[PDB]
Amino acid sequence: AAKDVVVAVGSNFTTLDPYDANDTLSQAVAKSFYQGLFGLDKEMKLKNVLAESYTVSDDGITYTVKLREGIKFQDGTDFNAAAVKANLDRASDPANHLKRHNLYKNIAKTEAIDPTTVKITLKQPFSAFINILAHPATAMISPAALEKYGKEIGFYPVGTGPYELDTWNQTDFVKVKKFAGYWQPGLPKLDSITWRPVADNNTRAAMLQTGEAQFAFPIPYEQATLLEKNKNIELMASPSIMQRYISMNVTQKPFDNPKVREALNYAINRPALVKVAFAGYATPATGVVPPSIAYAQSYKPWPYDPVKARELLKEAGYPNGFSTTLWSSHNHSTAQKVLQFTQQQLAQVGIKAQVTAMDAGQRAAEVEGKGQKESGVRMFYTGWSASTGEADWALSPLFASQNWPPTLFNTAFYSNKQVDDFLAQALKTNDPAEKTRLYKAAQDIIWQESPWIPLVVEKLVSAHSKNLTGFWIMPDTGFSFEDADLQ
Ligand SMILES: [Zn+2]
Ligand SMILES: [Zn+2]
Ligand SMILES: [Zn+2]
Ligand SMILES: [Zn+2]
Ligand SMILES: [Zn+2]
Ligand SMILES: [Zn+2]
Ligand SMILES: [Zn+2]
Ligand SMILES: [Zn+2]
Ligand SMILES: [Zn+2]
Ligand SMILES: [Zn+2]
Incomplete structure (x- = not known):
């Protein structure tokens, strides 16, 4: 067959x-x-x-x-x-x-x-x-x-690999066929795989319905319930490695004051945000590194407390909050709902933030391609995936003092003698113990200095036919189908 x-x-x-x-x-x-x-x-x-x-x-x-x-x-x-x-x-x-x-x-x-x-x-x-x-x-x-x-x-x-290129239609699809000389006897089990791009999100989910496709990803939030209710379809909400957060220019306006940073972190109701912006397909962030990454650390979650927050801003010296800017990268995903929710929560604590979604140009001009003594960046909503699966790429590009723009992506312009050295030390040893130790230390310093407002970590929503087994979505959004099969 x-x-x-x-x-x-x-x-x-x-x-x-x-x-x-x-x-x-x-x-x-x-x-x-x-x-x-x-x-x-x-x-x-x-x-x-x-x-x-x-x-x-x-x-x-x-x-x-x-x-x-x-x-x-x-x-x-x-x-x-x-x-x-x-x-x-x-x-x-x-x-x-x-x-x-x-x-x-x-x-x-x-x-x-x-x-x-x-x-x-x-x-x-x-x-x-x-x-x-x-x-x-x-x-x-x-x-x-x-x-x-x-x-x-x-x-x-x-x-x-187990498959050979059958044919590729630049826009239509990538079809690969079983490679008879594959070094592992008995694999692959499938005769062919056809990877089909489907830009329309609702159509992507719809194909699992008709049977037109046996696996699909990503799956729109609205279509999620529909599919999970189908007995022929398996809908999964798996962990991802996408960290969602708001960085603060720790060398600016009121953000130089660590009390403000600690304050603004109480202002956000994370469990509510996950519902409003991700339809429950994410979790409140309890760290700066997604837990799926190697060497990551997790901490007791931030409580939600507008009262504590307003009090702290006062101690800091802002009895009536203040105004700042909140930039995010222009997109069509969930970012829009995140901003509206965030600036609303910040409003509750007296923080009038001027939101602004930037295209590729402004983003590369105002955020990435600009140094401390010039940058306008104040509060920045963004995300990051450590596609290497280990702490270094999830930590260095974002907190190593040498990576401030236009060098790399430490949009919070954070810096810390110990962290930078702990990160450097980590790269010079191959002892897991030492590595888990070195990274754990840096993260503890980062989490306590709060250069961010870690928001959430997404969940990948995928779905496949009950007949298709051994086909998986990976946290980095890649697929694992070594033992894929059909019955
Ligand atoms: Zn030759
Ligand atoms: Zn030759
Ligand atoms: Zn063909
Ligand atoms: Zn063919
Ligand atoms: Zn090239
Ligand atoms: Zn079709
Ligand atoms: Zn499954
Ligand atoms: Zn309180
Ligand atoms: Zn657009
Ligand atoms: Zn399954």
Whole structure:
């Protein structure tokens, strides 16, 4: 019997060459034909994939990876230390100007000691490197295919995965078919997968209804109830890695005063916000890092208390609040309801905030491309996904004093001697204990200094036919379908 499943996704794909994509979706789909040395499961946990095992010098500089022998690429060629070298050399060559260059520029060189042994030496220590190797961007592509297609490799992928490219209709869909020579006997179980972009949200959910699609994501809030009521459809609300928050320019107006920051955090009723802006598909944030990320810490939740808040602003010296600005990035999602709710809650405590949604231009001009002594940024509503699955990318770009704009995304212009050093120390050790310890310390300082108003952490809403099993949504919004099957 023919097992042909259709997945209804959210947008169009950019490229099928992982190294050249900034959107998770395209990377997730390209996972049909590509595998990495390592990868993360649906709980965001480390797994050895094409790699058998690995070792790292106490110097943190040298990584020695053992590979599984006998694996073939979809074009008949062999997967070996040389192919890994070719994939890594290419990714770390700036001349290639591949969108994900920054994830490999720290690689000094890759050596093929033997067909099943790869020696990678970094320029500088970076304990999160193993995570970079498990990232869906680091795909092992066919050296032969890299040469045959050159710069068009992103259209005609050739990897070691369970599916081969059947055909791609730029706007219509990406259809992949079962690869007979897949290195794992018995897989895949499916004969084909058809990834179909469906921009209309209501239509996406509707297809699960008619049976037109067996899996879909994301699912609109209104359509959620409908689907969950259907016995042929399984609707899930899973944890994501999207942190929602409002940063405060800790070097400005009343925000320099830590009492104000502590105050404004009492002003927001988070459980109410999750209902009003996310339809209950999120949770109040009890940390600055989504708990699904490795090394994250969680704390006792912020109570909601307008009285405590107004009192604190008074002690601070603002018996009648004050006025400030609240910027958010222009979008069509839930942001709109978040702003209206927030400035309303802030109004209750006397904080007149002038909301403003900015397009790509103003955002890059007023928020990202601007330094402290110029920036107008005061209160900023935004979000962030640590797509590496570990604390560093969830913490450095947002709190490391060196990452203030236009360098990186520390919109709160926060800084702290200990945190910066704790973050730096973390990257120079590979001992889990030390790492959980170092990161835990930085987070405790951050949470207590409150440079933010951590709002919530979203929930991913997906749904699939009861018949489709082994098909999962990952916190980073990618898919895990190693053992997918149909009955
Ligand atoms: Zn490019
Ligand atoms: Zn050749
Ligand atoms: Zn040649
Ligand atoms: Zn076909
Ligand atoms: Zn065909
Ligand atoms: Zn249709
Ligand atoms: Zn399920
Ligand atoms: Zn109180
Ligand atoms: Zn728009
Ligand atoms: Zn199921």
